[PDB]
Design an enzyme around this catalytic site. Structure first.
Site, PDB file in Angstrom:
ATOM      1  CE  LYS A 101     -17.411  34.110 124.554  1.00 32.53           C
ATOM      2  NZ  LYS A 101     -16.533  34.726 123.918  1.00 32.53           N
ATOM      3  CG  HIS A 131     -14.376  33.659 118.690  1.00 30.60           C
ATOM      4  ND1 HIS A 131     -14.175  32.804 119.356  1.00 30.60           N
ATOM      5  CD2 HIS A 131     -14.268  34.772 119.526  1.00 30.60           C
ATOM      6  CE1 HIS A 131     -13.798  32.939 120.515  1.00 30.60           C
ATOM      7  NE2 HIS A 131     -13.740  33.995 120.740  1.00 30.60           N
ATOM      8  CG  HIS A 179     -14.897  31.614 127.423  1.00 31.94           C
ATOM      9  ND1 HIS A 179     -13.557  31.987 126.722  1.00 31.94           N
ATOM     10  CD2 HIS A 179     -14.201  31.139 128.398  1.00 31.94           C
ATOM     11  CE1 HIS A 179     -12.704  32.043 127.481  1.00 31.94           C
ATOM     12  NE2 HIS A 179     -13.030  31.426 128.652  1.00 31.94           N
ATOM     13  CG  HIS A 183     -15.816  35.565 127.978  1.00 32.56           C
ATOM     14  ND1 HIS A 183     -14.732  35.542 129.061  1.00 32.56           N
ATOM     15  CD2 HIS A 183     -15.266  35.450 127.045  1.00 32.56           C
ATOM     16  CE1 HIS A 183     -13.631  35.446 128.563  1.00 32.56           C
ATOM     17  NE2 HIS A 183     -13.798  35.358 127.240  1.00 32.56           N
ATOM     18  CG  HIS A 195     -12.278  39.485 120.966  1.00 38.09           C
ATOM     19  ND1 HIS A 195     -12.491  39.417 122.278  1.00 38.09           N
ATOM     20  CD2 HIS A 195     -12.446  38.179 120.666  1.00 38.09           C
ATOM     21  CE1 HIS A 195     -12.634  38.421 122.880  1.00 38.09           C
ATOM     22  NE2 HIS A 195     -12.566  37.425 122.132  1.00 38.09           N
ATOM     23  CG  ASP A 244     -10.281  34.170 120.479  1.00 41.31           C
ATOM     24  OD1 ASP A 244     -11.003  35.342 120.701  1.00 41.31           O
ATOM     25  OD2 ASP A 244     -10.091  33.311 121.315  1.00 41.31           O
ATOM     26  CG  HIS A 287      -8.731  35.532 129.195  1.00 40.61           C
ATOM     27  ND1 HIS A 287      -9.823  35.911 128.462  1.00 40.61           N
ATOM     28  CD2 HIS A 287      -8.198  34.274 128.446  1.00 40.61           C
ATOM     29  CE1 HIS A 287     -10.091  35.145 127.518  1.00 40.61           C
ATOM     30  NE2 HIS A 287      -9.073  34.423 127.605  1.00 40.61           N
ATOM     31  CG  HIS A 313     -12.300  29.011 122.796  1.00 42.97           C
ATOM     32  ND1 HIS A 313     -13.024  28.557 123.840  1.00 42.97           N
ATOM     33  CD2 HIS A 313     -12.434  30.347 122.903  1.00 42.97           C
ATOM     34  CE1 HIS A 313     -13.389  29.575 124.561  1.00 42.97           C
ATOM     35  NE2 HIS A 313     -13.026  30.750 123.911  1.00 42.97           N
ATOM     36  CG  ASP A 367     -12.278  36.732 131.312  1.00 42.38           C
ATOM     37  OD1 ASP A 367     -12.359  35.801 131.864  1.00 42.38           O
ATOM     38  OD2 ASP A 367     -11.787  37.347 130.605  1.00 42.38           O
ATOM     39  NE  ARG A 373      -7.504  29.377 128.569  1.00 47.58           N
ATOM     40  CZ  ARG A 373      -8.044  30.525 128.782  1.00 47.58           C
ATOM     41  NH1 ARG A 373      -8.430  31.189 129.811  1.00 47.58           N
ATOM     42  NH2 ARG A 373      -8.137  31.374 127.507  1.00 47.58           N
TER      43      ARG A 373
HETATM   44 NI    NI Z   1     -12.904  32.751 124.592  1.00 48.87          NI
HETATM   45 NI    NI Z   2     -12.415  35.437 122.429  1.00 48.96          NI
END
Ligand code: NI
Ligand code: NI
Ligand code: NI
Ligand code: NI
Ligand code: NI
Ligand code: NI
Lengths: 100, 101, 566, 566, 566, 100
Positions: free
Chosen positions: D216, D133, D245, D218, D135, D359, D319, D271, D220, D335
């Site tokens: 991935k 994970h 995610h 996600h 980034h 992460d 985010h 996660h 977003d 959350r």
């Molecule tokens: Ni995530």
């Molecule tokens: Ni992440």
């Protein structure tokens, strides 16, 4: 100044010791990195002053005591080694069981 | 004790020995300062400096290498010249010779 | 016209007869010769000499040098002279008089449009140092050595592994291959040593064919008569050098047995004094032999007040010894001897020991080979005075004898003198520029292959390069492809022929070692003495022709506290 | 002869029956087996065993290993044993008894001239960690992770760009190509993830064909049922993994709808506890499914007194959320839940959660994956005692269950276990050497592809490598070409077949992912539990089989203030 | 629906009519236009617009951009507008409205699965700066310049050598070749200048054929009428630019003679004010000519209370001058003039001086070209008010006139505007993102060739990228092969045709210079004034049309002590 | 903070000066690097305070005297140069023959 890589590297040791120095002053029990840095810096200044290797190997064992550091720390430091420029050039100082 | 100090033996050094020299009176008629380097072909210096350019042909200032002589506006002074050696070939400057001599 | 000698020195550097102090030592050199024509010196700057039609000519690139070091004070094994230095195609083109043949006399180094200039007036220029006892424990060692003035590093290792911590050996084809590849990333010339401790020749030949330029025989891997004979036999057929760290324990025999095993074959003995390793207590007697090329590692150089105290402990962490094991400690007093440590300094002064080296991070300081060599010269001058060979009121000969220890002699010992080791035409332009006050301590410029690779550099955002903080920073000669073009990776003749460079896709220039079997003690420049030396098995006293050889420990040394922040 | 157990441990490390404390935790491991023949242990050093004719034989390179780790205490998912480790051609050759068959018995790992030695007596050796994970916000993350003991990094990014700050996605062919090229410069194995959020399959296939080993999904970018189905369909045909995610906002549906969209297809849920993202408040119920491979990110591990306070803010900057916008903040409490955060720790102890990850710089700490995994084990031992599976008076099983979380399980989840993930023959030699007092905190040596890539290193100019200051510095395995030879760039099968490596002129070794669609929860080593878990929509209480699952927050943790300067 | 202007600005950045303060200066810009459709702005994040089927479409990579900078406030010579910026294949694709054509109106920049996003709302975006007066004294200069916002560096040097300390010249084929190779290692576009001081054309042609994009004529090498004519003749046939540092000593003639030698041919005059070098005291009169492209170096910009004091000394160390030599110092007062230094600031405000540059480490600060240019604009606004060209209550025109000085004008002067210099479609994506409070001082992101190359980065081990300490660190665009793909090495047409790139095995993208002979003062954007300027030979007073031109020295300046730690 | 390379580089100068500062306090005669660092740091603080270049060029010559440094040190430092951000931007301060 024409600082060589070794001189610059020692600036990092010095700064690490400044950190430990202030913490000990606050009355905290020092951890592993702080203890190593504090004692090491002490030896370097000793050499700058012109003390002998023999003298420093001894004096280095009286910088921090078992009650000034965290549990397990004395056992994590069987010895401490550092080199510095003595009047007669670079020499290695090894302090065995520095924390009693 | 001074680290890296010199112990220069006293005396002097004779420069450009065994070569032809001549003296020329030079006068700056321009309104701005002019400075000439040791190896510049004197005969091709700034046109504002009045002197016998014919006599200065193939010559340079007889001064230590790398130094210079400054001529403030209206300044007049006699300078000593020393002849070029080597192939005695001049290239550059104001482009007045661009060849031997 | 006429100029006074002092003003002359201030403008163009010292000339014939003038003396110069080396750093803060008691050593003084005297300019023996000046290759210039007074009044025709070339100097760069506003209104200076090096300008079109003047000190700079109209030639094409092929007819002039790429780089010229103006008004340099050369200090090399062959002389101490004032001259311009020309560099062309990455190599020394000429040592002479630079300028433009069109208007100046006696020009031997033509300057044209394609010529860069380095102003060396007032500076001392030397060849780059050569350290032949490198333990490749970490790559950071290269920058440290380059900063001190060392441009070639020969040794062995794979990194911080036990074998490497203790010995200069890059074990086998795979590791040799990997290190040769890694070598392209370092700004120094490099040659590797393989593990020579084996009694099967083929295991050694593979390593030589893989790329090593020598074999290290080390006691930690077993420095036995069988292993020694095997390594030398292979060395004799493949033209590579053998470095030796003998049997300290006297387990397989005494020094005479090892010498007998060597059988008159050429061999480089590491740390010949013995503190760094070797037959206790007389490995030092090896310097008496014609086939032995002897070197010292640097911690024992020179003998000082703190030397002994420090050594008793240092000799533990290196060789993986246990202080709780009697046998691992009881021999410490047999390996660290005041007697041989004091004698070693004199042996260097007499030319009996021919090389200095570090023994990087395994009982040696990588950035102190040059520094310590000069400290010994200083201490010997102070204690013994002028050498029998000196002439004039200067230390010129002593200086040539000592500079040879870390330049030309190491080069000759390892078969790379055809490429590096001194300032002679045709050799790679590995040069070091020094300010006299910092000689042997902190260089002004380090040139590799004709490109500056490292130098002190001030504030990057400043209006000039001099503002603080000033510290050593990598230059263009240390960047990617330019670096590859300015450094050499040395290979054995077999490796070179086998296409190893093409196979591993090595990017740097390649050089081949040769003449490793034919060099002998007599070939060491200014250091060819073969003394009739003996060591008392009980007292450890060193004697040459019956006279006791010894010296006194220094309490303070030059090139030390006046220059270093820590 | 005979030797006491204590003196034996001091010389060669602990043996069968001896227990060892892991750092300053309450976890104790006990040596389950020792592969040596007492008295025939190999040790390196002056006068030691590994010497010519003795512990070292006469074989050619092809018949012996390149590297041997002597007397290691192996801690892996398959056992905790004492043995020598042989490395040949950059891979694990054997785990057994090293030496010379000529004079020693039971030798399975031959040592010859071509063999380097790493002394591991008294040290614990583990496989390199694997963080899935990542980034790619900055390249500096690689060194940080390598220093902590992580040797493979899987993730996505283009640098410090909004998309990357929030998601592990390297968007499209161009960026994928550029990152694959950049990857050659980093000292860790690397695999990239593409943006899987699209409802047009071709847009995904291009990315896989370009080089990504996974996609991935996600929120977003829109974690909708359509996007999810599309990504999985492509994953099923191209044999790549999908990381998820989910939709925290419950915008397109609740967790049951996402699960329905997944339709029993293999997928790695990031996660899974939810603080890092996912259907509020029950994304955690995903660990009950056979096709779901669940992992945790590290900030919530383990539950401590400061956890909640810190999270409320951290969840903003990642985010791109606005604290002034009600909708952007009002959901924070939905959350970040104490209830699921406390349960997550127990779920790991039971084997319901199978992987740990970071992460990196997007609600996670890149250098703390290993460290935090062990802190959880400690906290669970303290709170719950021995696991039902434990045998003996040790925590051996709990240790195997947790080490698998960041080694073999991540490898299996992403289809790279044929290359890395554990210490088994044939796998790449990515190993980490640890001193017991610093286990999981600060490694003694990090080996990549058979070459040390990073390790603590003291003063470069010192006589030994131990003098201060000691800090991590890059070694030869991290330099240029040697690095390329010791690291792997993972590609999808399609990319590998399309000649992507040759097209972009990638210099590192290439590995292809496979088996991403066939792995399931049952394949996770020691972590295959599928609990009947539920989450109360209102109270957020987690229950397994009706029993409440929870734990207490730690006030102080091991592997913390005793080891770090800041 | 409806939204208030303030809340709108806070969410998407300012819009038409809104004004923004540039850092802590008195300069205010006003958004002249906004290319968005209100309500259809694209924003990235949890629950935001850029998501599958929404702001992100279903197109294949070829049909969408690789990178989109959302809601940017563009400040360029052509306008100050709000718009999205699309980047495709490393170049500017479009400036317009981004989104998904499937559901949104007026989309000109399609966003798909292959699109990365950089959120620029609230930020100002500009083209990367271009410094055409670089002395390659050390490689560290590149990072310093990149950090300040400069992405292209043109100059000459071989490192810290006397010739380079004083002049921007890379002497000859060998050094030119070596520097071109070294250039691949630097994260900025690079073009080299050769030594143009020779009276033999062939010596210059070789250098151009070797790879230089221009020739520097410098007085230290002899800036004579013969040398000047020769350089220009070669420049005219090979389409390369000539940079001039004239004869300060008036040794070969006065300024009128140099101008006569130039003979109306195109030429870039360095530090036209003269402090940096040039005919004392009237080199500044050159800006009156149609064929002269005039630039300033930065130490004299802007005129402050400490300027003069500082210059008297700085002018010594650069040109290798001797303070003990009368002739080397007496001219200092003739070169450093308060009169011309004060006038230079006004000449920039009027558009008479068209470029700003550094003169890195040779009387100039590499990291201060942009910073100082804006300080001058501020000081001129404060002293002179609005420009005759201004419209509205803003400083929009003054801003366009000054930004052109270090972007498009330098590009046009050196023949590289077809590749870089401004934000126009087809040009390389060298962009700089700025927070308004730090405009021109410390950038938020520096993009090279479409990849972020450097940016401020916080704690690597932190949960987010923002925690302290935050300092500039190299990103992926500066790593190995990715770097090669995102930077340009400029070559002359002859070099490009001769296969120089293939011969030296250059890895970076190659660009060819063109149009160096046809540019003239009239082509300089917003800076084409040819004033009837005169300089009193005695008082040094500068006059334009008889009126005295001067300004007052600043005691305090913006973009200074509020932003720097030292 | 957004520290640029130049700001970070100056942190090294500052730390080097802390070293010298403590040594001078102990009563030691400073060596070459210590002297350069001490005087340089003094100038940087001078600029932070807003002193003029002219003033600092003078004041810089009264930081250390010949009796506070080792033999040969004054001769090894013909001048000291350092730049810092004055209220009017970066400026260069050159202190000639700083140690008398
Ligand atoms: Ni995530
Ligand atoms: Ni992440
Ligand atoms: Ni040895
Ligand atoms: Ni050694
Ligand atoms: Ni100039
Ligand atoms: Ni310049």
């Amino acid at each position: 100044m024409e600082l060589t890589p070794r001189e610059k590297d020692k600036l990092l040791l010095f700064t690490a010791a400044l950190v430990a120095e202030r913490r000990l002053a606050r009355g905290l029990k020092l951890n592993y990195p702080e203890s190593v840095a504090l004692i090491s810096a002490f030896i370097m200044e000793g050499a700058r002053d012109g003390k002998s290797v023999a003298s420093l190997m001894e004096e280095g064992r009286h910088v921090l005591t078992r009650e000034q550091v965290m549990e397990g720390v004395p056992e994590m430091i069987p010895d401490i080694q550092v080199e510095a420029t003595f009047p007669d050039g670079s020499k290695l100082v090894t302090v065995h069981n520095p924390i009693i | 004790m001074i680290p890296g100090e010199y112990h220069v033996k006293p005396g002097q050094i004779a420069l450009n020995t065994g070569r032809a020299t001549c003296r020329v009176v030079v006068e700056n008629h321009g309104d701005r300062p002019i400075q000439v380097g040791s190896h510049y072909h004197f005969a091709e210096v700034n046109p504002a400096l009045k002197f016998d350019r014919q006599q200065a042909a193939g010559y340079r200032l007889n001064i230590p290498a790398g130094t210079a002589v400054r001529f403030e506006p209206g300044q007049k002074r006699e300078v000593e010249l020393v002849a070029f050696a080597g192939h005695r070939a001049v290239f550059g400057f104001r482009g007045e010779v661009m060849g031997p001599l | 016209s006429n100029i006074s000698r002092q003003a002359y020195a201030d403008m163009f550097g010292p000339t014939v007869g003038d003396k110069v102090r080396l750093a803060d030592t008691e050593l003084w050199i005297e300019v023996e010769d000046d290759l210039t024509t007074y009044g025709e010196e070339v100097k760069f700057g506003g209104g200076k000499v090096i300008r079109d039609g003047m000190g700079q000519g109209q030639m094409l690139a092929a007819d002039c040098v790429d780089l010229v070091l103006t008004n340099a004070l050369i200090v090399d094994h062959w002389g101490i002279v004032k001259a311009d230095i020309g560099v062309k195609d990455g190599r020394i083109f000429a040592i002479g008089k630079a300028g433009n043949p069109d208007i100046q006399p006696n020009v031997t180094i033509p300057i044209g449009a394609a010529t860069e200039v380095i102003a060396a007036e007032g500076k001392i220029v030397t060849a780059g140092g050569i350290d032949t006892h490198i333990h490749w424990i970490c790559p950071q060692q290269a920058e440290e050595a380059l900063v001190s003035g060392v441009t070639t590093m020969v040794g062995g290792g794979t990194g911080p592994a036990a074998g490497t911590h203790a010995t200069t050996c890059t074990p086998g084809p795979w590791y040799i291959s990997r290190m040769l590849q890694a070598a392209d990333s370092l700004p120094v010339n490099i040659g590797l040593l393989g593990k020579g401790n084996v009694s099967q020749p083929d295991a050694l030949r593979e390593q030589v064919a893989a790329g090593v330029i020598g074999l290290k025989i080390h006691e930690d891997w077993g420095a036995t008569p069988a292993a020694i004979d095997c390594a030398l036999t292979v060395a004799d057929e493949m033209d590579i050098q053998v470095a030796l760290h003998s049997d300290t324990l006297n387990e397989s025999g005494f020094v005479e047995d090892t010498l007998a095993a060597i059988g008159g074959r050429t061999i480089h003995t590491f740390h010949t004094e013995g503190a760094g390793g070797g037959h206790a207590p007389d490995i030092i007697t090896a310097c008496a032999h014609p086939n032995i090329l002897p070197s010292s590692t640097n911690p024992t150089l020179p003998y000082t007040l703190n030397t002994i105290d420090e050594h008793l402990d240092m000799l533990m962490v290196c060789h993986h010894l246990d202080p709780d094991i009697a046998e691992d400690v009881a021999f410490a007093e047999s390996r660290i001897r005041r007697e041989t440590i004091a004698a070693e300094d004199v042996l260097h002064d007499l030319g009996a020991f021919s090389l200095t080296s570090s023994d990087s991070q395994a009982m040696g300081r990588v950035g102190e080979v040059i520094l310590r060599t000069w400290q010994v010269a200083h201490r010997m001058k102070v204690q013994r005075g002028a050498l029998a060979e000196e002439t004039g009121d200067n230390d010129n000969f002593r200086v040539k004898r000592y500079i040879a220890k870390y330049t030309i002699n190491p080069a000759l010992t390892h078969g790379i003198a055809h490429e590096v080791g001194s300032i002679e035409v045709g050799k790679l332009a590995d040069l070091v520029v020094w300010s006299p006050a910092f000689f042997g301590v902190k260089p002004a410029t380090v040139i590799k292959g004709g490109m500056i690779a490292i130098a002190p550099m001030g504030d990057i955002n400043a209006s000039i390069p001099t503002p603080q903080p000033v510290h050593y920073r990598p230059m263009f000669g240390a960047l990617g492809s330019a670096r590859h073009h300015c450094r050499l990776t040395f290979l054995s003749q077999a490796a070179a022929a086998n296409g190893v460079a093409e196979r591993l896709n090595l990017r740097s220039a390649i050089a081949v070692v040769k003449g490793c079997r034919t060099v002998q003690k007599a070939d060491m420049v200014h250091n060819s003495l073969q003394p009739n030396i003996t060591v008392d098995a009980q007292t450890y006293e060193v004697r040459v022709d019956g006279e006791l050889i010894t010296s006194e420990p220094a309490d303070v040394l030059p090139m030390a506290q006046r220059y270093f922040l820590f």
